Design a protein around this motif. Structure first.
Motif, PDB file in Angstrom:
ATOM      1  N   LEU A 154      33.137  35.712  57.344  1.00  8.83           N
ATOM      2  CA  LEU A 154      34.547  35.751  56.967  1.00  8.83           C
ATOM      3  C   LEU A 154      34.823  34.864  55.758  1.00  8.83           C
ATOM      4  CD1 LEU A 154      36.232  35.737  60.484  1.00  8.83           C
ATOM      5  CD2 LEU A 154      35.793  37.673  58.973  1.00  8.83           C
ATOM      6  N   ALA A 155      34.144  33.717  55.671  1.00  4.47           N
ATOM      7  CA  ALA A 155      34.313  32.852  54.506  1.00  4.47           C
ATOM      8  C   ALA A 155      33.829  33.545  53.236  1.00  4.47           C
ATOM      9  CB  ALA A 155      33.573  31.533  54.717  1.00  4.47           C
ATOM     10  N   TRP A 156      32.650  34.169  53.300  1.00  4.37           N
ATOM     11  CA  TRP A 156      32.165  34.929  52.153  1.00  4.37           C
ATOM     12  C   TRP A 156      33.113  36.069  51.814  1.00  4.37           C
ATOM     13  CZ3 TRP A 156      31.208  40.032  51.477  1.00  4.37           C
ATOM     14  CH2 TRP A 156      30.551  40.404  50.302  1.00  4.37           C
ATOM     15  N   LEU A 157      33.719  36.684  52.830  1.00  2.56           N
ATOM     16  CA  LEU A 157      34.689  37.742  52.578  1.00  2.56           C
ATOM     17  C   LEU A 157      35.884  37.213  51.799  1.00  2.56           C
ATOM     18  CD1 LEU A 157      35.606  40.572  52.791  1.00  2.56           C
ATOM     19  CD2 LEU A 157      36.310  40.176  55.156  1.00  2.56           C
ATOM     20  N   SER A 158      36.379  36.034  52.173  1.00  3.12           N
ATOM     21  CA  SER A 158      37.470  35.416  51.420  1.00  3.12           C
ATOM     22  C   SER A 158      37.064  35.163  49.974  1.00  3.12           C
ATOM     23  CB  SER A 158      37.894  34.109  52.087  1.00  3.12           C
ATOM     24  OG  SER A 158      38.904  33.462  51.335  1.00  3.12           O
ATOM     25  N   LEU A 159      35.881  34.580  49.775  1.00  5.54           N
ATOM     26  CA  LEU A 159      35.391  34.352  48.417  1.00  5.54           C
ATOM     27  C   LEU A 159      35.339  35.647  47.621  1.00  5.54           C
ATOM     28  CD1 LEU A 159      32.580  31.702  48.008  1.00  5.54           C
ATOM     29  CD2 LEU A 159      34.937  31.767  47.177  1.00  5.54           C
ATOM     30  N   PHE A 160      34.790  36.704  48.220  1.00  4.84           N
ATOM     31  CA  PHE A 160      34.597  37.949  47.490  1.00  4.84           C
ATOM     32  C   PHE A 160      35.921  38.636  47.198  1.00  4.84           C
ATOM     33  CE2 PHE A 160      34.583  42.545  48.462  1.00  4.84           C
ATOM     34  CZ  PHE A 160      34.127  43.007  47.246  1.00  4.84           C
ATOM     35  N   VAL A 161      36.895  38.534  48.105  1.00  3.64           N
ATOM     36  CA  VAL A 161      38.173  39.190  47.841  1.00  3.64           C
ATOM     37  C   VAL A 161      38.934  38.440  46.756  1.00  3.64           C
ATOM     38  CG1 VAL A 161      39.373  38.004  49.721  1.00  3.64           C
ATOM     39  CG2 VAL A 161      40.251  40.170  48.857  1.00  3.64           C
ATOM     40  N   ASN A 162      38.808  37.108  46.715  1.00  7.06           N
ATOM     41  CA  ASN A 162      39.409  36.375  45.602  1.00  7.06           C
ATOM     42  C   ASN A 162      38.719  36.713  44.285  1.00  7.06           C
ATOM     43  OD1 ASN A 162      41.248  35.005  47.335  1.00  7.06           O
ATOM     44  ND2 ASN A 162      41.084  33.182  46.037  1.00  7.06           N
ATOM     45  N   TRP A 163      37.388  36.813  44.305  1.00  2.60           N
ATOM     46  CA  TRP A 163      36.654  37.252  43.122  1.00  2.60           C
ATOM     47  C   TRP A 163      37.109  38.633  42.673  1.00  2.60           C
ATOM     48  CZ3 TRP A 163      33.771  41.691  42.894  1.00  2.60           C
ATOM     49  CH2 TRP A 163      33.025  41.893  41.728  1.00  2.60           C
ATOM     50  N   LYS A 164      37.356  39.531  43.626  1.00  6.33           N
ATOM     51  CA  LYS A 164      37.772  40.884  43.284  1.00  6.33           C
ATOM     52  C   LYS A 164      39.170  40.888  42.686  1.00  6.33           C
ATOM     53  CE  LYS A 164      38.809  44.068  46.331  1.00  6.33           C
ATOM     54  NZ  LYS A 164      38.638  44.864  47.578  1.00  6.33           N
ATOM     55  N   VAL A 165      40.077  40.081  43.239  1.00  7.21           N
ATOM     56  CA  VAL A 165      41.400  39.938  42.637  1.00  7.21           C
ATOM     57  C   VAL A 165      41.280  39.458  41.196  1.00  7.21           C
ATOM     58  CG1 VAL A 165      43.616  38.772  42.793  1.00  7.21           C
ATOM     59  CG2 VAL A 165      42.501  39.572  44.865  1.00  7.21           C
ATOM     60  N   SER A 166      40.459  38.430  40.962  1.00  3.90           N
ATOM     61  CA  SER A 166      40.319  37.895  39.609  1.00  3.90           C
ATOM     62  C   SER A 166      39.733  38.930  38.653  1.00  3.90           C
ATOM     63  CB  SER A 166      39.451  36.638  39.628  1.00  3.90           C
ATOM     64  OG  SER A 166      38.289  36.838  40.411  1.00  3.90           O
ATOM     65  N   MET A 167      38.650  39.594  39.059  1.00  2.00           N
ATOM     66  CA  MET A 167      38.010  40.562  38.177  1.00  2.00           C
ATOM     67  C   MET A 167      38.895  41.781  37.958  1.00  2.00           C
ATOM     68  SD  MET A 167      35.550  38.966  37.172  1.00  2.00           S
ATOM     69  CE  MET A 167      34.580  40.103  36.185  1.00  2.00           C
ATOM     70  N   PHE A 168      39.772  42.086  38.917  1.00  2.00           N
ATOM     71  CA  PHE A 168      40.700  43.192  38.722  1.00  2.00           C
ATOM     72  C   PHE A 168      41.801  42.815  37.743  1.00  2.00           C
ATOM     73  CE2 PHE A 168      40.333  46.755  41.964  1.00  2.00           C
ATOM     74  CZ  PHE A 168      38.962  46.626  42.045  1.00  2.00           C
ATOM     75  N   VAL A 169      42.309  41.582  37.836  1.00  2.00           N
ATOM     76  CA  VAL A 169      43.208  41.082  36.799  1.00  2.00           C
ATOM     77  C   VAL A 169      42.534  41.168  35.434  1.00  2.00           C
ATOM     78  CG1 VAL A 169      44.557  39.114  36.015  1.00  2.00           C
ATOM     79  CG2 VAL A 169      44.406  39.615  38.443  1.00  2.00           C
ATOM     80  N   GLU A 170      41.241  40.845  35.378  1.00  2.00           N
ATOM     81  CA  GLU A 170      40.505  40.944  34.120  1.00  2.00           C
ATOM     82  C   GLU A 170      40.437  42.386  33.621  1.00  2.00           C
ATOM     83  OE1 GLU A 170      37.226  42.334  34.185  1.00  2.00           O
ATOM     84  OE2 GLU A 170      36.522  41.890  32.154  1.00  2.00           O
ATOM     85  N   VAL A 171      40.121  43.333  34.507  1.00  2.00           N
ATOM     86  CA  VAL A 171      39.904  44.705  34.051  1.00  2.00           C
ATOM     87  C   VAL A 171      41.228  45.368  33.687  1.00  2.00           C
ATOM     88  CG1 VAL A 171      39.930  45.712  36.361  1.00  2.00           C
ATOM     89  CG2 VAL A 171      38.687  46.865  34.521  1.00  2.00           C
ATOM     90  N   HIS A 172      42.340  44.909  34.277  1.00  2.00           N
ATOM     91  CA  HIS A 172      43.640  45.453  33.882  1.00  2.00           C
ATOM     92  C   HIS A 172      43.910  45.222  32.400  1.00  2.00           C
ATOM     93  CE1 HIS A 172      45.290  46.930  37.651  1.00  2.00           C
ATOM     94  NE2 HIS A 172      44.956  45.808  38.263  1.00  2.00           N
ATOM     95  N   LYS A 173      43.291  44.195  31.816  1.00  2.00           N
ATOM     96  CA  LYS A 173      43.316  44.047  30.365  1.00  2.00           C
ATOM     97  C   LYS A 173      42.138  44.771  29.725  1.00  2.00           C
ATOM     98  CE  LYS A 173      42.386  41.879  26.284  1.00  2.00           C
ATOM     99  NZ  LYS A 173      41.091  41.823  25.552  1.00  2.00           N
ATOM    100  N   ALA A 174      40.949  44.645  30.324  1.00  2.00           N
ATOM    101  CA  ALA A 174      39.731  45.170  29.711  1.00  2.00           C
ATOM    102  C   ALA A 174      39.787  46.685  29.522  1.00  2.00           C
ATOM    103  CB  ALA A 174      38.516  44.783  30.550  1.00  2.00           C
ATOM    104  N   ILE A 175      40.708  47.364  30.212  1.00  2.00           N
ATOM    105  CA  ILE A 175      40.860  48.803  29.999  1.00  2.00           C
ATOM    106  C   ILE A 175      41.358  49.086  28.587  1.00  2.00           C
ATOM    107  CG2 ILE A 175      42.116  50.859  30.731  1.00  2.00           C
ATOM    108  CD1 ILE A 175      39.833  50.074  32.556  1.00  2.00           C
ATOM    109  N   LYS A 176      42.269  48.251  28.080  1.00  2.00           N
ATOM    110  CA  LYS A 176      42.802  48.468  26.737  1.00  2.00           C
ATOM    111  C   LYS A 176      41.712  48.350  25.679  1.00  2.00           C
ATOM    112  CE  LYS A 176      46.532  46.588  29.115  1.00  2.00           C
ATOM    113  NZ  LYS A 176      46.718  45.326  29.880  1.00  2.00           N
ATOM    114  N   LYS A 177      40.628  47.633  25.990  1.00  2.00           N
ATOM    115  CA  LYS A 177      39.485  47.589  25.083  1.00  2.00           C
ATOM    116  C   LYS A 177      38.919  48.983  24.852  1.00  2.00           C
ATOM    117  CE  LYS A 177      35.214  46.444  26.227  1.00  2.00           C
ATOM    118  NZ  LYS A 177      34.335  47.322  25.404  1.00  2.00           N
ATOM    119  N   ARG A 178      38.938  49.825  25.885  1.00  2.00           N
ATOM    120  CA  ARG A 178      38.436  51.186  25.740  1.00  2.00           C
ATOM    121  C   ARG A 178      39.445  52.064  25.010  1.00  2.00           C
ATOM    122  NH1 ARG A 178      35.705  51.941  31.809  1.00  2.00           N
ATOM    123  NH2 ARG A 178      34.153  50.270  31.550  1.00  2.00           N
ATOM    124  N   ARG A 179      40.698  51.623  24.939  1.00  2.00           N
ATOM    125  CA  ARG A 179      41.731  52.337  24.195  1.00  2.00           C
ATOM    126  C   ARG A 179      41.778  51.874  22.741  1.00  2.00           C
ATOM    127  NH1 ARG A 179      46.344  52.151  28.964  1.00  2.00           N
ATOM    128  NH2 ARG A 179      45.851  54.189  29.895  1.00  2.00           N
TER     129      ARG A 179
END
Ligand SMILES: [K+]
Ligand SMILES: [K+]
Ligand SMILES: [K+]
Ligand SMILES: [K+]
Ligand SMILES: [K+]
Lengths: 255, 255
Positions: free
Chosen positions: B230-255
């Protein structure tokens, strides 16, 4: 180390209170079960003990295969309506367990189904939450402009939201369940809290009773209420996350 | 809006595939149940249908109060070892349901216990997660300094973390359960995933079997593994939130 040293004792005291709140009932239930066992044995001397074990083995053999022990099996069936809500219990991390896959082909499909749905559904609920929060906040701020804004106005709006949630999800439902399901109040409140916190033991499920005259849309109303409860839970937990930053700021004021 | 229609289609297709996967097995299960049901009456013409219904009723009374249908009943007892892990399953929102309160006094205590513990425990797990993430990223950055830092070193470290989690929580455990519990691989993997995501149907619990020679620390090792998962799950879901915030910008790179 500051949290674990308290949660260890939390578990210890929880066990210490549960062991005394429940063990007498468990002991009397076991004693009654064995008493009725021997009395069924004496009622049928024609029926032997080693046949009673066979009957018990047959009953337990398919009580874990899906078919219910007694009555008809319409509510635990695997057709369309039951499946469409089993999918929901899967993808909301509730997992009651009254119906579950029993085939190696399905047991492996459910894994990927959860892995691909649970992260998606936990966003849909957050989206509903943020949308309803936007609506509530715009209405409250418009009505506060028509009135007067206050340094404590946020306290008022937040308290109104919290009491709305508590009322709709812990104090009103138990009466509906008293009416339509014939549970007492403590059962209904316990079940409501279990369901809202995505714990879902699976001893009380709403809308599944062979001896019931439910209306055709009762089950789906229950499901929609559950979804709205989860959305409000998301809203309140984010609000409380931010208010925790607020209070960790305000604590230094007291110093 | 955009999410709700996708969710509805997901539920529909999930219900369809589950119905097509599980319905044949369910139907054959209940048909075999009824076949042996009549075969029992055939074996004992001395026994009557209504006697069978009374036996089934007595047995169905047991599963509700908690006493097990058959065999030794030590693992579902209400003493200290069972009670501690039951409190754990309550305060990690897993809620298997193999043991649950049956008294109006306890059913009401469990509500406040959950309300006061679940928010506490969900922070302790996040605390363990952030601490282990600090340690791991610290060691990784130290060893990256000892070598060379790279523009894609984040990719390396994050992928290493994710594969560590997947291995230790979904690919290695099923073999341990093959050994100590005598399940096949699909059962062990299904159970591991369904426990890691705090779903917890309650058909497979690791450490409860009257026909077992478990070691005295097996149950607590299982519980500790669950907590680390469960602790690793918390770490990974926070990592996923962060990387998703990142990709919400990184998509415009493809535009
Ligand atoms: K859960
Ligand atoms: K759960
Ligand atoms: K459950
Ligand atoms: K559950
Ligand atoms: K169950």
């Amino acid at each position: 180390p500051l949290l674990t040293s308290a949660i260890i004792f939390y578990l210890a005291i929880g066990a210490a209170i549960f062991e005394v709140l429940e063990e007498p009932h468990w002991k009397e239930a076991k004693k009654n079960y064995y008493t009725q066992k021997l009395h069924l044995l004496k009622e049928f001397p024609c029926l032997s003990q080693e046949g009673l074990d066979k009957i018990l083995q047959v009953v337990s053999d398919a009580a874990d295969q899906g078919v219910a022990i007694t009555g008809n099996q319409t509510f635990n069936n695997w057709n369309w309506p039951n499946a469409m809500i089993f999918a929901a219990t899967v993808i909301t991390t509730i997992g009651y367990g009254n119906v579950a896959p029993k085939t190696p082909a399905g047991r492996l499909f459910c894994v990927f189904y959860g892995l691909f749905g649970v992260p998606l559904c936990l966003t849909w609920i957050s989206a509903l939450g943020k949308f309803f929060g936007g609506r509530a906040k715009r209405l409250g701020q418009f009505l506060t402009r028509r009135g007067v804004s206050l340094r404590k106005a946020q306290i008022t709006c937040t308290a109104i939201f919290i009491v709305w949630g508590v009322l709709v999800h812990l104090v009103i439902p138990p009466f509906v369940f008293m009416v339509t399901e014939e549970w007492n109040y403590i059962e209904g409140l316990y079940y409501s809290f279990i369901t809202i916190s995505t714990i879902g033991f699976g001893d009380f499920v709403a809308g599944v009773n062979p001896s019931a005259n439910y209306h055709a849309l009762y089950r789906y109303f229950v499901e929609l209420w559950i979804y709205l409860g989860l959305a409000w839970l998301s809203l309140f937990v984010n609000w409380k996350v931010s208010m925790f930053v607020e209070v960790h700021k305000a604590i230094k004021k007291r110093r």
